[PDB]
């Protein structure tokens, strides 16, 4: 079985490279962040532009949704995160304390916490209600490229250019596992599988790997794409067939069979590096977005 993703919409409006797209948990919305300092909200099914959210003083590298789809958090080169009320567009809180660019962010499932990663080599855990920093983890010895909570929020996984993935106990901030592999290539992305048992990690040697968190073992590797320079988002697709989805520096979206590791589809149409992909929570829909020469977001639909 192979998917048949086809282009449905191209969404234009960002005036610089797009950095990150994410579907709302309720499936209604796509949020996008950009080097142009803006967040934009779009209808997930009709592609209709809904609104622009502004206030950061420099570009935004990441954005993430609360579980109830009512809040957004953004990570910016202005060294802050911001918490936004989506319906009003207002900045509820500015999270201050990182000493360099904030690169990555995520809510926990309860959505009382935010985790952030920075070029300052730290991971920070923040209280949503007060905006205070609860914990600073001395997580890595190089920029932190990704941070993600597991399905109940008890664990954080982080990745770094230092070549490590680390698993942290949320409650205590203590490191539970370090993933190392061979020649330590920079790790550009990491995230938990939906069941929380596996971790998907990208390295800047054109490689994706699936790790069993319990065992410390690599189970699958995925290759054929181009990834040497950028921190590109990758995904588990679970609404139909079980795929791995990733952007690529050859301007394509790559889709693999998770079990067999065979490439099952490449989505053509972007005209610059595909820096971000996202998988819709219930429909077989992919959102992709590209860098400077393109600046658009594409929505794609498949029967499986």
């Amino acid at each position: 079985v192979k998917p048949n993703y086809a282009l449905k919409f191209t969404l234009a409006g960002h005036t610089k490279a797009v950095s990150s797209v994410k579907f709302s948990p309720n499936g209604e919305w796509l949020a996008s962040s950009s080097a142009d300092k803006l967040i934009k909200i779009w209808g997930a099914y009709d592609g209709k532009f809904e609104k622009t959210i502004s206030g950061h003083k420099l570009g935004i590298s990441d954005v993430a949704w609360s579980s109830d789809s009512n809040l957004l958090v953004s990570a910016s080169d202005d060294k802050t995160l911001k918490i936004w009320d989506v319906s009003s567009g207002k900045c509820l809180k500015t999270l201050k304390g990182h000493s360099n660019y904030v690169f990555c962010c995520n809510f926990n499932p309860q959505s009382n916490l935010i985790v952030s990663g920075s070029f300052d080599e730290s991971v920070r855990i923040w209280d949503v209600k007060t905006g205070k920093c609860l914990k600073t983890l001395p997580a890595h010895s190089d920029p932190v490229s990704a941070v993600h909570f597991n399905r109940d929020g008890s664990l954080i996984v982080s990745s770094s250019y230092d070549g490590l993935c680390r698993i942290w106990d949320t409650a205590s901030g203590q490191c539970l596992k370090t993933l190392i592999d061979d020649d330590n290539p920079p790790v550009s992305f990491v995230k938990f599988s939906p069941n929380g048992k596996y971790i998907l990690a990208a390295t800047l040697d054109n490689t994706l790997k699936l790790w069993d968190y319990s065992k410390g073992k690599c189970l699958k590797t995925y290759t054929g794409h181009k990834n040497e320079k950028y921190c590109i988002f990758a995904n588990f697709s679970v609404t139909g067939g079980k795929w791995i989805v990733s952007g690529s520096e050859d301007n394509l979206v790559y889709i693999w069979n998770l079990q067999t590791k065979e490439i099952v589809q490449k989505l053509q149409g972007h005209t610059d590096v595909v820096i971000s992909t996202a998988c819709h929570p219930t429909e077989n829909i992919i959102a992709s977005a590209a860098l400077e020469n393109d600046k658009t977001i594409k929505l794609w639909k498949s029967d499986c």
């Binding site: 797009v18 950009s34 820096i275």
Partner: peptide, 6 residues
Amino acid sequence: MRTEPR
């Protein structure tokens, strides 16, 4: 920025 190469 994520939009700049390493």
